[PDB]
């Protein structure tokens, strides 16, 4: 129990993230280091440097809350669209600043909620989350074959993306509907920017009237019994995706894609896919829980493999050079990585069902990941 729980509380990673078993200098250095590679491309590349200096002086200096919101929205509203990659990091660090000190309550949360509820900020953060993820973790995850096991709801748990935890949870505590709104937005952006590559147009997201219908259902749940037009279609598509998910011989790609949107639309608008008869007959909820635990654990092996291979692939501007992870082996690694992986597998295997149509989604990826990860820890 504590044999590894103590170890995960001591090393450099695994603290910023939450494990299914259950720092100011670090980002200050990255802030300082951001301005180095900017000047090397001066040979149109000056506005980014101006923005970087503005953000650096904004974060480092002390500003009264009555002016900080204006300062942070001035820079954030200006950015619109190798050059492109440097631009995304400009706003990713920009809206990290809000969460950076809100945890210290340098800004009243009432003003923070007032800022976020603006239609611009919601879309901006929903877009920048998927862009930041695809910029860094997608390349590493593509090699392992865990590319299809990247879930929008599950992105907040990675250590880098810890500055969406507050933006979602505090918002949910204070303003219920906007949390589901930005969840819908972020999954729409994820499905549009290649995180879920599909040829057909998405029928659940990137459409204002769909969200309006979902919200109208949310506030008056007795609409599901006798819904009007434009909600027959949404329920029919839910049923079609559920049937695709529950299939046995269906292709893995499109089945996982259907599961992802089904999980999003059921988590953020609860009681939309819950059928009393069919779900009980086909063990719907248990299968969803099994697949969700499978996705969590797959992200866990992904992080473990990235850490073991690093001993930069966490991502550009992710971890600074001084605070990097050295290649040298350590005494505790042998006694605390194999056991950690084994306990993760044991915990996963105890509350995941087995079936002819589920073993390919829960058991088979777990065994494949175990085989891949047990043959490279010494090397």
């Amino acid at each position: 129990s504590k044999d590894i729980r103590e170890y995960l509380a001591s090393t450099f990673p695994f603290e910023q993230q939450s494990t299914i078993l259950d720092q100011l200098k670090f980002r200050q250095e990255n802030l300082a280091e951001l301005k180095d590679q900017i000047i090397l491309s001066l040979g149109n590349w000056q506005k980014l440097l101006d923005y970087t200096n503005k953000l650096d002086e904004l974060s480092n200096t002390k500003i009264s809350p009555e002016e900080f919101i204006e300062e942070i929205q001035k820079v954030l509203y200006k950015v619109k669209l190798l050059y492109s990659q440097f631009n995304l990091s400009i706003q990713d660090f920009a809206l990290q600043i809000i969460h950076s000190k809100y945890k210290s309550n340098q800004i009243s949360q009432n003003d923070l909620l007032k800022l976020i509820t603006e239609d611009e900020m919601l879309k901006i953060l929903a877009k920048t989350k998927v862009l930041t993820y695809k910029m860094k973790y997608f390349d590493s995850a593509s090699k392992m074959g865990i590319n299809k096991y990247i879930s929008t709801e599950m992105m907040d748990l990675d250590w880098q993306f810890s500055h969406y935890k507050t933006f979602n949870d505090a918002l949910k505590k204070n303003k219920a509907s906007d949390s589901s709104y930005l969840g819908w937005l972020t999954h729409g952006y994820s499905i549009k920017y290649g995180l879920s590559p599909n040829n057909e147009r998405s029928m659940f997201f990137q459409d204002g009237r769909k969200y309006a219908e979902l919200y109208a259902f949310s506030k008056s749940p007795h609409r599901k019994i006798i819904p009007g037009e434009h909600l027959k279609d949404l329920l029919a598509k839910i049923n079609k995706s559920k049937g695709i998910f529950l299939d046995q011989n269906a292709l893995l790609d499109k089945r996982i894609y259907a599961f992802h949107e089904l999980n999003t639309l059921e988590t953020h608008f609860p009681g939309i896919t819950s059928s009393f008869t069919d779900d009980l007959k086909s063990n719907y909820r248990k299968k969803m829980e099994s697949v969700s635990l499978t996705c969590q654990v797959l992200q866990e092996i992904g992080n473990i493999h990235r850490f073991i291979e690093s001993k930069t692939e966490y991502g550009l501007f992710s971890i600074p050079k001084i605070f990097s992870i050295p290649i040298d082996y350590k005494h505790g690694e042998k006694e605390n990585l194999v056991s950690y992986v084994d306990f993760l597998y044991s915990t996963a295997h105890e509350r995941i069902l087995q079936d002819n149509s589920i073993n390919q989604l829960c058991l088979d990826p777990l065994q494949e990941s175990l085989n891949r990860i047990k043959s490279n820890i010494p090397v």
Partner: protein
Amino acid sequence: YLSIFPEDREIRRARLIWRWISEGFVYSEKQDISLYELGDSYFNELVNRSMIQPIGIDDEGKVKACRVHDMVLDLICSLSSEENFVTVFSDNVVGKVLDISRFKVLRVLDLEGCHVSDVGYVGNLLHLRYLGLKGTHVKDLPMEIGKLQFLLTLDLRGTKIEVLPWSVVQLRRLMCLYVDYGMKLPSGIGNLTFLEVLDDLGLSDVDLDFVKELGRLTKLRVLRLDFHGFDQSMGKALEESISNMYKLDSLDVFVNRGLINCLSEHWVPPPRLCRLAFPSKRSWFKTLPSWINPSSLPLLSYLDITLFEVRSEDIQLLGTLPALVYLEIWNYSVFEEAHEVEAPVLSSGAALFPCATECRFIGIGAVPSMFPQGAAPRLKRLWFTFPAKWISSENIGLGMRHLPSLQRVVVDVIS
């Protein structure tokens, strides 16, 4: 004509009405009507004669779609199949086998719902009238579409085209422009003097003169819009632009999380209005707009208004409308803000709801006893909110004085 449609699948009435016009069963010599109203009416007696049955209600206050009876399909086939009578119905054989440009003259083209994008050859046919591409996965359309002087329809819902070419302004004749809101219209829209219905016009980050050009388009009956980027006095232009044309029969303005700086308190609406919808429930009017009076717009059959607060006299004023067949009034204060569910008090009047079958006071503290002496003579449906603490001094009653066939309530947690 429906024999072209397959055996077992729903049929939308809008496509039938448009294609009948396009190929030529609709000709009006009166020049007092726009040959769209009569087409819809024609479909109305067609469904009236019990030959076809209705299914659903679309966003035009009419039947969404229909389905022909199975014993009538073979009947119409036997009547008019062997005699002389192109489209793709969920078939992938198109393109790789059949050649479309080979046909020298053809009246209508409809290939919606397919997964093929090879349309760049529209200049080979000129007698074409209907051009529908709903959900055909078409990336782009040819630049020389303007050659088709004869044109009535242009269907582009659910496609990947991101901007229309400017060579559609030259179209001397055009009736319906089914545009998705995401893609931007070309400028100079005012030259489309014969435009008849305009659906889901994307309207944001647009200069004022384009808005002014709309009012030259004096032939509308439905006008579905939205806006996200000019929440300022720019919309004051379209405020009076909508006032110029006098043939409105439906209208709705989608807009999210903001006060409606679109419709003014001193405005003259078209003398005819039926739908006047507001699909987005996150928006609100400051109060009940002053232009809703028994004097003007006395022909509403649909309200669907969300507003920040429902005053005690708001429902009193709403009850004075002559027809008001359907009524759905929301209460933004109760749901999105911590405000008590106040109970309305309708006292004056005698009839107060001549023909109001549907009434959906979502979030309103309306009570069945609050209607005095049959305030709603028919009221087939009713929704309201009833906090549990209201059990004192004969609040509810529910006298059943007005034969409410069904009726659904919402419970409240407190007390």
